[PDB]
Amino acid sequence: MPEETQTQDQPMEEEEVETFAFQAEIAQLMSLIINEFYSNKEIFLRELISNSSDALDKIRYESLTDPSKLDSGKELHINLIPNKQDRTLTIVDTGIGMTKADLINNLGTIAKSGTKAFMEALQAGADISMIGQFGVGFYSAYLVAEKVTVITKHNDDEQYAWESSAGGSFTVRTDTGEPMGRGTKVILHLKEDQTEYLEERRIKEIVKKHSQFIGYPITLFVEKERDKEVSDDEAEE
């Protein structure tokens, strides 16, 4: 059953790229969260780690079809890699975070109606605390992220590199990086107001208590940017 596999790739680029602007109804959701004056809600760690757990449960489901073990040979897990020099936090997923059809469909961002009829239920019923559990608000990551960059490649399928955050537009274009077989690279840039929220010990202790509920392999690893040098310089371009 070959669902994918449709030619190597067409050498037709420069299609004016894909640029999407936050729609009026989306401007409401985006405003309602940022106009909170930023109360800091690190609870999102548990919300997001739940979805990534689903992504591993998804590949785990695919392992029922796989007669080798799980994916290929060794293993599959959630890896957290903080880069203090770049001020970036890179989470690499080796499962199935998202699919290409859902990617273009604007995962849980496609309101069309009027934001959501749940806005009314928000007046007397639910709160913003269920932001991610509704499966229609994973873009709320901008709450604590200045820049949200996602690069992903799927096995046999093409490569995708798209930008996200808040403030203007959303962009998606064909990728040609070719860094892995099939992984989701979630790297978001910390704001200068979060320079102290980069303590490894903080992360260690926080995930220690929350991961007690999640029964899946997680790894806090850090690769020291060596050999080369990554810093702020002005010479490129």
Could you tell me the sign of the dihedral formed by the alpha carbons of 194, 195, 200, 201, in that order?
negative
For residues 173 and 20, the answer to whether their CB atoms sit within 8 Å is: no
DSSP for residue 46: H
Could you tell me the two tokens for 33?
């969260």
Sequence-distant (6+) residues with CB within 8 A of 214 are: 49, 50, 53
Q: Which of 199, 136, 183 is nearest to 207 (CA)?
A: 199
- 95: exposed, middle or buried (C-beta count within 10 Å: 0-12, 13-18, 19+)? buried
Tell me how crowded residue 133 is: count the other CB atoms within 10 A of its CB. 12
Instruction: Write out the binding residues for ATP.
Output: 51, 93, 112, 138
Residue 59 main-chain phi, psi, to 5 deg: -65, -35
The partner residues of 186 in beta bridges, in order of sequence, read: 91, 150
List Cα–Cα distances, 122 to 47, 92, 128, in angstroms. 19, 33, 8
Tokens of 73: 């040979």
Amino acid identity of residue 58, one-letter, is: K
- Which helix (H) or strand (E) segment holds residue 30: the answer is helix 24-34
Q: Provide the phi-psi class of 174: left if phi over 0, else alpha when psi is between -120 and 50, else beta.
A: beta
Which one-letter DSSP state was computed for residue 190? P
**Token duo for residue 223:** 């690769």
Contact present, 219 and 76 (Cβ < 8 Å)? no
From residue 15, how far is each of 18, 19, 82, 164, 170 by CA, in Å? 8, 11, 35, 19, 16
Distances, alpha carbon 147 to alpha carbons 63, 125, 207, 221, 231, in Å: 34, 32, 23, 22, 18
CATH fold of 18-220: Heat Shock Protein 90 (3.30.565)
Q: What is the DSSP letter of 105?
A: T
Candidates 214, 190, 215; CA nearest to 202 is: 190
Q: Tokens for 14? A: 């420069």
Do residues 166 and 142 lie in contact, with contact meaning Cβ atoms separated by under 8 Å? yes
Beta-sheet pairing, 78-83 with 218-220: parallel
- Whether residue 58 contacts residue 99, with contact meaning beta carbons closer than 8 Å, is answered with no
78 vs 80: CA distance, rounded Å:
7
Q: Which two tokens stand for residue 55?
A: 């992504």
**Domain residues of the chain, as ranges?**
18-220
Q: Which amino acids are annotated as binding site, given as ranges?
A: 51, 93, 112, 138
Q: Which experimental method was this entry solved with?
A: NMR
User: Sign of dihedral through CA atoms 193, 198, 201, 207?
Assistant: positive
Per-residue CA distances from 111 to 119, 136, 138, 164 (Å): 12, 9, 13, 17
In contact, 190 and 87? CB cutoff 8 Å: yes
CA 1, CA 3: separation in Å to the nearest integer?
6
Dist. CA 173–CA 55, nearest whole Å: 23
- Give the residue before each break in the chain, using a C-to-N cut-off of over 2.5 angstroms; say none if it is continuous: none
